[PDB]
Paper text:
Parkin is an auto-inhibited ubiquitin E3 ligase activated by dual phosphorylation of its ubiquitin-like (Ubl) domain and ubiquitin by the PINK1 kinase. Parkin is an autoinhibited RBR family E3 ubiquitin ligase consisting of an N-terminal ubiquitin-like (Ubl) domain followed by four Zn2+ binding domains RING0, RING1, in-between-RING (IBR), and RING2. Like other RBR-family E3 ligases, Parkin binds to an E2, and ubiquitin is transferred from E2 onto the catalytic C431 residue (on RING2) of Parkin before ubiquitination of lysines on target substrates. Furthermore, C431 on RING2 is occluded by the RING0 domain of Parkin, which inhibits Parkin activity.
We wondered whether the lack of density in the ACT region was due to the preference of ACT to remain associated with the cis molecule rather than to be complemented by the trans molecule. To test this hypothesis, we determined the crystal structure of the ternary trans-complex of phospho-Parkin with cis ACT using phospho-Ubl (1-76) and ∆Ubl-Parkin Q347C (TEV). pUbl formed a stable complex with untethered ∆Ubl-Parkin Q347C (TEV) and resulted in the displacement of RING2 (383-465). Fractions containing trans-complex of phospho-Parkin (1–76+77-382) with cis ACT were mixed with pUb-3Br to get the crystals of the ternary complex. The ternary trans-complex of phospho-Parkin (1–76+77-382 + pUb) with cis ACT was crystallized, and structure was determined at 2.6 Å. Interestingly, in the structure of the ternary trans-complex of phospho-Parkin with cis ACT, we could observe the electron density of the ACT region. Furthermore, K48, which occupied the ACT region in the ternary trans-complex structure of phospho-Parkin with trans ACT, was disordered in the ternary trans-complex structure of phospho-Parkin with cis ACT, similar to what was seen previously in the phospho-Parkin structure. Overall, our data suggested that ACT can be complemented in trans; however, ACT is more efficient in cis.
Author numbering:
A (entry chain A): 102 to 107, 144 to 353, 356 to 378
B (entry chain B): 1 to 75
C (entry chain C): 1 to 72
The structure:
Amino acid sequence: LTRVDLNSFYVYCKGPCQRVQPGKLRVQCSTCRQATLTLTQGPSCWDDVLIPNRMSGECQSPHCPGTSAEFFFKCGAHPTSDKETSVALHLIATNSRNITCITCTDVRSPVLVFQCNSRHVICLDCFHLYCVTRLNDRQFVHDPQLGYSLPCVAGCPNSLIKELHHFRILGEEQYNRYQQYGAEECVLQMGGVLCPRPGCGAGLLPEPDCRKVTCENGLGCGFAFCRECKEAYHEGECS
Amino acid sequence: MQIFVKTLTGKTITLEVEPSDTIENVKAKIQDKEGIPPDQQRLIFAGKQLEDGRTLSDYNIQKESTLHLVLRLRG
Amino acid sequence: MIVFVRFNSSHGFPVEVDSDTSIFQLKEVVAKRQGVPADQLRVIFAGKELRNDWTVQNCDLDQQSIVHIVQR
Ligand SMILES: [Zn+2]
Ligand SMILES: [Zn+2]
Ligand SMILES: [Zn+2]
Ligand SMILES: [Zn+2]
Ligand SMILES: [Zn+2]
Ligand SMILES: [Zn+2]
């Protein structure tokens, strides 16, 4: 697993690195969650390690009939425990061939490879700014299947980042803001409403027909408002 | 592992979960803490609505990460 | 360097090895610690059993990584 170069892979280390780091591919047994399973064959693509249960083996634990392999990643920047895992940022690759950043044209490493047809390559600096600026301007795209993402910076079709942990490049505070905005957008995409009472903003999913929306045990602020004008609930037409 | 469920008001609930716990499990836990019936709960991670059948590991939801909780109003 | 040894899901204790230490040598010290024969021990690391003749560095064992060792 270690010698596989599907050019090291990169994780987001939440601690103590708090950054994108070269990762280690490892594997446990998907049944007893112990790193005793031996792989039948090694993974050849990302799908082999990312798709659950895709690869098989034999858990060498005495009382375990585990056959399915569960791949996990660890930060390679320091010793990690057996369960001290990190999310794989599979779009990030060592820029071994010195591909120039689609945006700033500089050669940096590593880089993010957009899954557009052109496999557009962006340095992490530009990706960070691309993310920060698009976030602040509410330019992140909501996809009902994928979530709150960004396409290729070139704007290539069918290029929305699927692994949304890539937006870990936003740093902690902006990442949480991203998650917040995404959830808000999701609510609005599902035809819901954000509670308009100041210091609230609770995501609400009322009946599509309902005009009366009550921000109802400790979650809502109790404000009963009109869906349309967002003022205190009223009979008849708005204003 | 410890995860956080936050309403869009920033109201935060801590959950003890396993990466193998289903979204339906998460909701049951949310109900256990706050008393929100699971049918009213919609969990969102990074803008994607989490499906009851899937697990946290299905979404690569890490230790100390945050799910967003919004409410399905039925009244 | 140090290698962590998880012996049948037991808490990983450290084993100081050398770059050229064989897997069997590692099996020995573990066997001495666990009071078991070294022949009934298998060394699982990175989804592959490590063969007795392989050296620590050969197996791409990084400093303070973990190897599982099971029995029979
Ligand atoms: Zn790290
Ligand atoms: Zn097992
Ligand atoms: Zn750049
Ligand atoms: Zn592109
Ligand atoms: Zn409210
Ligand atoms: Zn109105």
